């Protein structure tokens, strides 16, 4: 058996990865992603993130860097080594290393 990637991000980031071939509906008809509008509340993103990191099918979660900062509490609380979380840049948004949850954990980095 394999696993699938999942996405939490704006319409453009989600659309990009869907055309990258990332998207699948689960047998319960739920997708492997959330589109985030500017009016989306913290509970929608966070409960989705808490679902995605605990589902059996999802092996990687992509989070837009701005959303990743809005959910930073639950994100930095995610300590499991296998279900990986990638903070990713976007067209009107901060760069790839801004407050990155993995880079901050290294002692060797300045």
């Amino acid at each position: 058996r394999g696993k699938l990637i999942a996405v939490i991000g704006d319409e453009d980031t989600v659309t990009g990865f869907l055309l990258g071939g990332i998207g699948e509906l689960n047998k319960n008809r739920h997708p492997n992603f959330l589109v985030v509008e500017k009016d989306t509340t913290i509970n929608e993103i966070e409960d989705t993130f808490r679902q995605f990191l605990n589902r059996d099918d999802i092996g990687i979660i992509l989070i837009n860097q701005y959303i990743a900062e809005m959910v930073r509490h639950a994100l930095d609380a995610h300590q499991r080594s296998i279900p990986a979380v990638l903070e990713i840049p976007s067209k009107e948004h901060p760069y790839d290393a801004a407050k990155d949850s993995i880079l901050r954990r290294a002692k060797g980095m300045f």
Binding site: R29, K38, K91, E92
Partner: protein, 348 residues
Amino acid sequence: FPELYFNVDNGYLEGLVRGLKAGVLSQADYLNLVQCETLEDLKLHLQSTDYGNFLANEASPLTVSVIDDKLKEKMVVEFRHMRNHAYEPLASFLDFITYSYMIDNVILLITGTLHQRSIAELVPKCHPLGSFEQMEAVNIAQTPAELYNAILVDTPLAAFFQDCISEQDLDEMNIEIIRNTLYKAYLESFYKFCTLLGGTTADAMCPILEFEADRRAFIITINSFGTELSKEDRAKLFPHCGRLYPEGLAQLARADDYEQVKNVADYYPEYKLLFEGAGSNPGDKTLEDRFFEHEVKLNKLAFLNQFHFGVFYAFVKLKEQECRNIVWIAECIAQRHRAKIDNYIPIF
């Protein structure tokens, strides 16, 4: 001879829509928009022309999605204001312009019901020109079969569905084949309708639709070679009102490689120049961009006749191209990638 009636009913709107076309960015205005460093500069430039105050009463953390939606809002209010005024000889013609957006809204509606998603959730995604007159299809949403029956009653689009879409076909066909087979019926019918509006309207609208029919034929063909569409499927989607209909469409149906498409385009100087004009080389303009440049040429030429409804169509497509230009510029500005920014299409 048509001049000598046209201004009885349309004279006001003809003056209005040319006036509205004067409110477009010139080549020098695009050459000014690209000079800047942030979307606040896009606001400050656009504040000097007809779009001024379009970002008043809006949040300071501005985004390209807000510029896109506000430019569509101006385009659609500029069009609703003409459609609400026009009398029956023109009002049917403006409704044919709206069909170029209602087809895509019908594909969203069909796609929602096939996925059992409530149609009312898709109304905010649907394009604002393609507003359905009766929302009762949307309010019911009960099944795809209910949607089909409801469209065939609630919408004046029903006459196009009856020719190409059965209820069984609606479930069995891929939605992108439904999109294109609808557009075939629309474009052939809008062409026939324009040839009933004889003289200037036919003579200077029909070249744009004849081109759109040929554009569809080329663009459908080159995009099909890696795909499930057979020779019959390409032919079934090509619009029969283009110049290529007697022969070129048949050769494009037979075609299986981009060289064979170029061979068809090489019989007609108007199309030979597009395929010579873009080789898809590194740093080149694409073939699609050459068709957008040519579409703008034809639309500009439609403003050179006086008394015809062709200006209302050419206006909508040029404001759509202007929205697309402002958004592309705003993306190249916001994404810092100014190197390709010149890929906007100049208009007037």
